[PDB]
């Protein structure tokens, strides 16, 4: 296999426990947990060979709880989240404790906020190719917009005729703030196809945005802004 | 300049005891107190010239523990005979009445690396001015160990070094007088 | 500690350069990773001595001289991302990372055709965004009030051996990109 | 008697002429038996008995492990020598010499390193000499008793002495 970390994103209010899951490579007994901040500074947190801890820092001992239960995914749980716990949690596996050849996973992007209250899913819209572009270039460019979501924990993908696509696609490097003065976020993505392909009514376009939110307890009038998929559709007109 | 540095480590069952030490030309440089998790230098003056993160030793140990279980299952848990030590007692310097000296109990060529040692003055155990070393490695598979007794040479006192091991039928005692 | 140089790099397609990591002590070995847009650390290299070639990348490591190098040749869009070196001092069970190098591969726009189109929402003719597209790498894009303007980003229409840049603004399309 | 189970490992760094020629020897022991070796001159793991064969199989099929192993001659063995060469290698403790009759006895104690020469002069005497041999004290000092059968000078030479010591 390969190192698999979940959830890819996570959000918690101060005081809440924040658990993170990790599955090592197949036949990899050694597991590491590192912490990376936004300044790209890494910090060793704990180390495992199978179920037994090889080493850990003083912080992890007090504030963290970590296990690698047999036939079970290694886990790392913060017992009481703080704003300073916000960082990327990298898990890495190894075949041999002697070895220094580590394989890192995707990681879990944890964010700690005062209260979940500001957690809003994205609103997603798809905008159809302009007649001007079609005639001038014979190419059709769709634009997707995800707006008013928080935190900026989203995964955007394009789906065409029942299949994810990467060719002709490009997505903004990072979601921007709708108001720089915290804030709610927005993100756009482009999918470009030949004018003909767009003009074919047998072709179906969908912009699919995965949102990472709550699971959990919700005490507010509106619907629970849970981890969900918000999507938008467009059709091939001729 | 022909020298040898030895990183010697092990884990022992069913005693559940481990060790991590370094050795230079036959003498211990340091070892790690696993329980207190710290580097213990053989001579205090060594600390000024080097350092060693004790954490690494505890890590290795844990892996030694794991490997031991592997080795046990691989050999069907097939036990093995014990090897009894050869005990020898001698002063550190020429002995003069009234002049502070040191008795050395030398336990050698034995395994497993687990023994109880007792200093005896006139048949009575001694808990004052007694030192010991961890289990030191030899060229071979067997172990070595030193125990030290601080004393004041008199014609009235006699000493014994009692060593208990699983290879022996009964605790072995080596005698020493000023005579 | 690990001094990794340089901080950032911009490479036009098919050009080359070198990264470097200097160490303040003896490392057991070195490792190079690339964090892609996703943030997933693609493993690039492991070596405890000498050199290794893997495609358009080659890495070297000298534990005695306390340095490691990563060379890139014939740069491609796929090479973009932040590169990190990582090494274990031979006195520890723990890894140490460099500050990283942000690499960015500039695409070559053969036939530049800048233009700003307007797109209607597929669900309602009420909403509309502005698409600035087909400009060349030279060009840049700035950010007023409720008016949003994403950074730029290039897409690759492989089936037509065609590539283009684009940016999006939303809040008239004539004034949006001044 | 009582069963016991020992996982015992020695990682040996050998130096023939300082850092001139360095050799790494990793030796694995189970109970009373050495079962596996890694000799940097061979560059590979080699079982010594049946018991070490599975390990040899496994580790030798791990390219990067063997790779990191071969490097440890430098990362670990060389790295440490430069450290110890500062205090351990150049260590010198002058011997204390004493002559007394129990059979005359030359007592050479409290000295380091081990190499020493103890000679009896009556002209030198190569007869009626027996010694306990070199004795390690366990505290970075050696001692030895060289005895001359008589019915007299004792000379000592040692790296800690520019000029020899006499009676």
């Amino acid at each position: 296999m390969k190192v698999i970390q979940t959830p890819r994103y996570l959000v918690k209010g101060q005081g809440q426990k924040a658990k993170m899951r990790c599955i090592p490579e197949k036949g990899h007994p050694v597991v590491f947990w590192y912490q990376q901040n936004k300044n790209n500074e890494f910090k060793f947190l704990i180390n495992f060979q199978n179920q037994e801890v090889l080493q850990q820092i003083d912080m992890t001992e007090k504030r963290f709880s970590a296990e690698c239960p047999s036939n079970s995914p290694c886990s790392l749980e913060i017992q009481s989240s703080e704003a300073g716990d916000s960082a990327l949690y990298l898990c890495a596996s190894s075949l041999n404790n002697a070895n220094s050849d580590y394989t890192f996973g995707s990681g879990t992007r944890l964010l700690v906020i005062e209260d979940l209250k500001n957690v809003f899913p994205p609103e997603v819209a798809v905008f159809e190719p302009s007649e001007a572009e079609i005639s001038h270039t014979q190419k059709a460019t769709l634009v997707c917009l995800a707006t008013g979501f928080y935190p900026d924990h989203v995964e955007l993908s394009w789906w065409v005729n029942g299949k994810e696509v990467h060719s002709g696609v490009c997505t903004d490097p990072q979601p921007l703030k709708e108001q720089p003065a915290d804030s709610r976020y927005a993100l756009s993505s482009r999918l470009r196809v030949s004018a003909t392909f767009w003009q074919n009514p047998r072709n179906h376009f969908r912009c699919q945005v995965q949102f990472y939110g709550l699971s959990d307890e919700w005490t507010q009038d509106r619907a629970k802004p849970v981890t969900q998929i918000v999507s938008a559709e467009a059709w091939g007109r001729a | 300049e022909e020298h040898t540095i030895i990183q010697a480590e092990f884990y022992l069952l069913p005693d559940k005891r481990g060790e991590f030490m370094f050795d230079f030309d036959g003498d211990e440089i340091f070892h790690v107190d696993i329980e207190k998790s710290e580097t213990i230098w053989r001579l205090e003056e060594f600390a000024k010239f080097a350092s060693f993160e004790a954490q690494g030793a505890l890590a290795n140990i844990a892996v030694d523990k794991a490997n031991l279980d592997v080795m046990k299952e691989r050999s069907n848990n097939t036990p093995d005979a014990n090897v009894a030590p050869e005990v020898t007692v001698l002063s550190r310097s020429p002995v003069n009445l009234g002049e502070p000296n040191i008795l050395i109990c030398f336990i050698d060529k034995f395994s497993p690396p687990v023994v109880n040692v007792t200093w005896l003055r006139n048949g009575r155990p001694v808990t004052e001015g007694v030192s010991e070393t961890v289990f030191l490695p030899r060229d071979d598979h067997l172990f070595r160990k030193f125990h030290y007794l601080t004393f004041l040479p008199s014609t009235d006192d006699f000493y014994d070094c009692e060593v208990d091991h699983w290879g022996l039928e009964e605790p072995l005692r080596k005698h020493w007088e000023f005579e | 500690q690990v001094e990794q140089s340089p901080s950032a790099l911009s490479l036009h397609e098919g050009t080359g350069s070198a990264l470097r990591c200097n160490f303040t002590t003896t490392m057991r070995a070195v490792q190079w990773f690339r964090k892609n847009s996703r943030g997933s650390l693609i493993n690039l290299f492991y070596l405890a001595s000498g050199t290794k070639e893997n495609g358009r990348l080659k890495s070297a490591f000298d534990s005695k001289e306390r340095y490691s190098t990563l060379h890139i040749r014939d740069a491609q869009l796929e090479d973009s991302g932040t590169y990190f070196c990582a090494a274990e001092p031979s006195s520890g069970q723990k890894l140490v990372f460099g500050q990283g190098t942000i690499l960015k591969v500039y695409l070559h726009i053969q036939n530049p055709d800048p233009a700003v189109y307007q797109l209607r929402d597929s669900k309602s003719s009420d909403k509309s965004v502005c698409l600035f597209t087909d400009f060349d790498s030279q060009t840049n894009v700035s950010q007023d009030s409720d008016v949003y303007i994403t950074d730029k980003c290039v897409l690759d229409m492989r089936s037509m051996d065609f590539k283009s840049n684009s940016a999006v603004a939303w809040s008239a399309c004539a004034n949006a990109f001044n | 008697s009582r069963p016991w189970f020992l996982e015992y490992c020695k990682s040996e760094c050998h130096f023939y002429n300082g850092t001139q020629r360095v050799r790494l020897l990793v030796r694995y022991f189970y109970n009373l038996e050495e079962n596996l070796r890694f000799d940097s001159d061979v560059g590979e793991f080699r079982a010594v008995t049946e018991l070490g064969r599975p390990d040899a199989e496994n580790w030798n099929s791990q390219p990067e492990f063997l790779e990191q192993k071969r490097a440890e001659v430098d990362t670990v063995c060389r790295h440490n020598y430069e450290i110890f060469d500062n205090f351990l290698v150049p260590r010198r403790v002058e011997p204390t010499v004493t002559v007394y009759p129990t059979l005359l006895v030359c007592s050479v104690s409290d000295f380091y390193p081990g190499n020493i020469e103890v000679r009896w002069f009556r002209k030198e005497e190569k007869t009626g000499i027996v010694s306990t041999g070199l004795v390690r004290n366990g505290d970075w000092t050696f001692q030895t008793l060289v005895m001359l059968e008589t019915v007299y000078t004792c000379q000592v030479e040692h790296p800690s002495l520019t000029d020899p010591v006499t009676v």
Binding site: - | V63 | G92 | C9
Partner: peptide, 13 residues
């Protein structure tokens, strides 16, 4: 007081 290097024990099994 430089830091002494050591071999990390290898995993069996």
């Amino acid at each position: 007081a430089d830091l002494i290097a050591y071999l990390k024990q290898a995993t069996k099994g």
